[PDB]
Symmetry: D2
Subunit: 134 residues, 4 copies
């Protein structure tokens, strides 16, 4: 699926966010997501060896705090003009479990594409969220 | 150290945030922190078995996105009208490593107290942040 | 890739592990991996809200402790006869970053198949 | 009060030391851990450094112990590579240990030799993970 105007806006928002702060090894990626009501949420990562969140997960916390229950699209943007970063595996899993069908923006052959997170986890592990077990 | 006026405001802010969203197993705690220039940032947790961030780590990402490099105080508040939660061990580590000397607000004998995160990790492990190693 | 004799031996090992221990509130999956020296390492998950490791990550730590530099295959077997579990997304990332080309054993149409971890992360994010 | 290092404690230091010394110096695998169960078996492992929260050595040990059917761990230590010696558990490890192995004693440095400290004492104003439905 090709990048929409809304997707380009997410790229632009996340780029503005990461470029708005000093270059840091700890806070090096911004993410923005849009809700089904059209609100945009953004954040930056927190790098730490105990599993500090990616930018996408910070965005999930910001959206939750705003009561935006349904997120439809999300992108991650690297610092220093480095562009789109695909979601890492952890981000894919958390997004598939908590926001099924959310589309992540990634680099593609003819231009950026918008890919449902489940397609980013072929042969998926689907957490049964009703239980505190794997 | 007894709770300060700014500390009470962080409690009030986090309380307002968590009680402003539907009760959820997954988005169940809010956090608020203040910067050295008086800016207050908030967020909610994202529970997930792959290590979804606590509310405190969402706040760190929000604060970083705003360019607030120095955070001085932080609190976490439970849902359903329910009050202060001390930081978990992971939050203590991340806070100690990334925001040295930040005070966490916790329950105390005469009222809430504000404790330097390092005092919440006796016999501390200090990450040498210059390296991708423990 | 169809399941190999080595992959079946790995499934036997992981199944033996999870079926050999009691029920717990904190674990539910065993994993086993193969090294390019023919070594096999196993472990069970550690469930915790701060990101306790999956079984596969425990296995990586056991491999590392043994000085085992290259792992070629891995599988995760759930308790209660639930069978093979595909790696979760975090496991895929760690495996791709630390053990490029490792094959995860997953369930496909004709039974278990073995799939390079990179194929389990289309449009991959590579840690620099 | 902290207990002085026991013979079993020293055997864990020796185990972790032999483990970490027996492998190539690496930034990804830089710490070994060893723990002893009530049934007297010793379990060991090395950390897996990764930005998605790859486990510390202690967490690997918990998985090793569980796979072996050893449900009760009483003492644990972490030994760093390059003769760097005892590392105290990080904040995440303290939380996981307290929640999963209450009363386990961590071996940490002391002014008069190493001491063995109940992990709850390493988390003043402790956060306890509480849910019967899940
Ligand atoms: Cl984690
Ligand atoms: Zn990520
Ligand atoms: Zn926490
Ligand atoms: Zn996993
Ligand atoms: Zn640790």
């Amino acid at each position: 699926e090709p990048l929409s105007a809304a997707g380009q806006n997410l790229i632009d928002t996340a780029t503005s966010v990461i470029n708005g702060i000093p270059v840091s090894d700890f806070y090096s990626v911004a993410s923005a997501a849009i809700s089904d009501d059209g609100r945009v949420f953004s954040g930056v990562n927190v790098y730490h060896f105990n599993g500090g969140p990616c930018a996408e997960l910070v965005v999930l916390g910001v959206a939750a705090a705003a009561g935006a229950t349904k997120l439809t699209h999300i992108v991650a943007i690297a610092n220093e003009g480095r562009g789109i970063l695909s979601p890492c595996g952890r981000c894919r899993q958390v997004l598939a479990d908590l926001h099924p069908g959310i589309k992540a923006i990634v680099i593609g052959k003819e231009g950026p594409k918008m890919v449902a997170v489940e397609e980013l986890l072929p042969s998926i592990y689907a957490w049964d969220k009703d239980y505190d077990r794997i």
